[PDB]
Amino acid sequence: TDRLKDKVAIITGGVAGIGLGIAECYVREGAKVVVTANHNVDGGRAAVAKFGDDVSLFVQQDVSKEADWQKVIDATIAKFGRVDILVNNAGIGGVNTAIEDLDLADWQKVIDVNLTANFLGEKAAIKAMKQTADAKGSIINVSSVAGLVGLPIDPAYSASKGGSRLLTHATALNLAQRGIDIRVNSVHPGWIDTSIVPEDLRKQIIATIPVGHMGQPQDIGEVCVYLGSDESRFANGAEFTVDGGQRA
Amino acid sequence: TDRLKDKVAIITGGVAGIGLGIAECYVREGAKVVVTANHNVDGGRAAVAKFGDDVSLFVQQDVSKEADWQKVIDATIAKFGRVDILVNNAGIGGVNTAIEDLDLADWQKVIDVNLTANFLGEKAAIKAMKQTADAKGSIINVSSVAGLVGLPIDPAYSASKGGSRLLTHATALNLAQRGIDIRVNSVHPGWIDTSIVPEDLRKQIIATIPVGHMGQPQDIGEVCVYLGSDESRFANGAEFTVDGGQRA
Amino acid sequence: TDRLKDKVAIITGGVAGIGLGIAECYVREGAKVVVTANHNVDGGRAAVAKFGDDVSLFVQQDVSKEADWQKVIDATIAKFGRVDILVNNAGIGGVNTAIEDLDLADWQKVIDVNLTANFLGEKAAIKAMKQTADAKGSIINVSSVAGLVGLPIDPAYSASKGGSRLLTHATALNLAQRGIDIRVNSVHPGWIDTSIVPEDLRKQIIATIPVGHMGQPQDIGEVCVYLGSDESRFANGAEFTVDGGQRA
Amino acid sequence: TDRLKDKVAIITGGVAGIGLGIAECYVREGAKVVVTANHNVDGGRAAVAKFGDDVSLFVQQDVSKEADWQKVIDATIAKFGRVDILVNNAGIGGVNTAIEDLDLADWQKVIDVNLTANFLGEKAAIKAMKQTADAKGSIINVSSVAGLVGLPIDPAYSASKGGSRLLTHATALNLAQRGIDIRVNSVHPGWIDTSIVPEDLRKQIIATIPVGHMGQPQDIGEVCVYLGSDESRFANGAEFTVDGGQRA
């Protein structure tokens, strides 16, 4: 009955909030998980303690670093022998500062983590899937509907989001044309309740949500199980939004 | 399992092809189904036979007719006592004809069946869910990515599809704003291998499919299980495409 | 030199607000105009007085009526000898009532006026262009970004808008595939300051506009001059939004 | 005529092909142009020779380099005293190679030139417009509908394209929110017949174009004249596609 039986998944930013929600759903459905985080060893160790070290592994990872991708792939294969699913969930939020005041370094850091990182991950995953999973698998690029509560005014955040969306389409088709059965899809969470916020802000947030409340981390986990499993074999290069109607 | 335990679903055009695949998945997951068809009595009887009459019911229905909607609602409540899910799947395909040669009656028939029918269905389903299911439910509007092999040149078919897409958004928001927990989403199948695919066009159809092959009815059934179940409680007014990369 | 020199245009809903501003720009650029309205003879006469009866003509027209389209075509050809441009601008607004409370007759009226009317006009213009303009011309379907101030919750209004958008694509492609050089594009005004904007809502409306103010009828006129003229010969099946950032 | 009377415009990649087409239309409408190019001194000198030293200037520019932007702004201000319009037209095309074979350096090259360059341009333009044009101006981001003949399989090309589109929206809104009258819009050319179009590839290319022929450089120029001028004062954060129906 386990919908992800025998699957091995890598989930970046997988030790807290949304990513932890995905990992929880994956473990529930019988998947072995490798959860990564750049600077959250405590969260990492706690997740493995929660899941059990027989079905989970924590690896420190900066997703913008090509070398950390090879590190994570190697650790996943040593521990679990294969790679079936990659969830690119790690990311940086938006800021409300003026575009003409944006330092190139701050633009570049966002592109590095929210866009280029997704490419680096897809490429690493694809190679590992050809090597260990008979050239089959599933890749999921997660990017929120909004990074800011107001108008989407953050140039770097928005650019990285639009970039990742089209990256998803192009990657799927690039593989598809060559008969490689590795699917690439994107998932777009609305506002998910992962921490406390000042009540003025929270009201603003919930005001942007037609159903009048935030979602939960496992709401994202559920659509990720669908996309990770063989149930969605014909879903490819597509976008899956779970946002309480936020962009309806 | 039983991801749809005790749910009662109405599936239009549910006795052949995509609709039947949806029905199969729903029954697999514990749903009670009412499958309908305009001109397929034998198919309806045969589907009930394989599902069993304790968990399925066949009702003859022309989805373009308001009176037939009340007929199905009435029969559904008589048999199963409630309505939890409506899958608007029934509809007609596109044609090659010149725009300026199109008769109003022929335009109108397509609008009636492929667009107006979905409004009538949503309205009938909402009333039934308010009356019998504590004003909670899930409505799924199914609309193919493509109605024709080549360029989407059919004005009535395209209009109806674009129409149904925005209907889904507006209906979900209309309900959400009044705090009614009835979610409305759309599903968009690519080319699915069924008897209604024109034989002479099969090889040409496949050449438009990036993954190089048609999908199966149960591929659409799986995403419909997700959207019918409470697993998708935060998915609303959104579009779920299962198409082998066709519109990627 | 006049950018619409020798061109003959029909503009529906052309004697008030947006339609009148389109007419004003067209006349300024040397076009001859046939402006129509369903119930506004005084406005029609006043527009002709302003423009001059040598370059303009008023015809009463209900755009939802097939017979009225033939009437307008006949009168245009009788007065000006040809038809080069059709601007489908006439239409009705949205309401904020519950989807499940909507009468079919009320749904149907909006689809008749805001969707089917556009098909009728396209068909009438195409035959006229083939007959009198060497099978060349430009058709413009105008549908605003928003019909209501708040969330787009009107199902009939939204469906007709989504419907008219894809109608534009399909018609453009239907013609192009047969080598017919009649272009079909859509124009999408944001909030324009005219007498038909509800007084009570003017302040709430302006809040939804990123640039902080409404536009002017001639703002829509300018983009329509571009689309009606030979300047946009390669612009086809496309969407031109002039909305002060409304849907950005 | 002079629809761009007294306006000063910077056009990157403006000495051949599409860029040159924009430059020609701009000069026709009374604009003064600064055309740039990374490695085409000949093309640059030919353009200035054609236009005349009094209304045109050529400056060498690598759009990926922050320092070259400061150089081009300084040169424009020394020559013409102000900056009114920026057309980000410079760009790299796509390749048909496999995503998992793509080197980070080659990915990064495309992001640098086709995405980050647009940001650097916007930023420099905005500063110059606040400084010299009373905080009013128009910025146009140009990106082709397709880089490749076949499926859009280039991950870097597509990502930068999707990124540039969203950058346009966010940048427009970032400015608009602060009451800054600098509009940002994008333009999307289909296949345009320029010197870099080789044989028989022509057949495949034209086969993707519903109107059955490539467009001309001035087709892109004409819509850019609309966006650069005061005729489009309410067009903001929007996408203007001129592609003969290619993505319809």
Automatic annotation (TrEMBL), chains A, B, C, D:
Pfam families: adh_short_C2. The keyword Cell inner membrane does not apply. GO terms for biological process: bile acid metabolic process. InterPro entries: NAD(P)-bd_dom_sf (IPR036291), Sc_DH/Rdtase_CS (IPR020904), SDR_fam (IPR002347). The keyword Mitochondrion does not apply. Keywords: Oxidoreductase. It comes from the Bacteria. Coiled coil: none annotated. GO terms for molecular function: oxidoreductase activity, acting on the CH-OH group of donors, NAD or NADP as acceptor. SUPFAM superfamilies: NAD(P)-binding Rossmann-fold domains. Belongs to the short-chain dehydrogenases/reductases (SDR) family. NCBIfam families: PRK07231.1. This is 3-oxoacyl-acyl carrier protein reductase. It comes from Levilactobacillus brevis (strain ATCC 367 / BCRC 12310 / CIP 105137 / JCM 1170 / LMG 11437 / NCIMB 947 / NCTC 947) (Lactobacillus brevis).
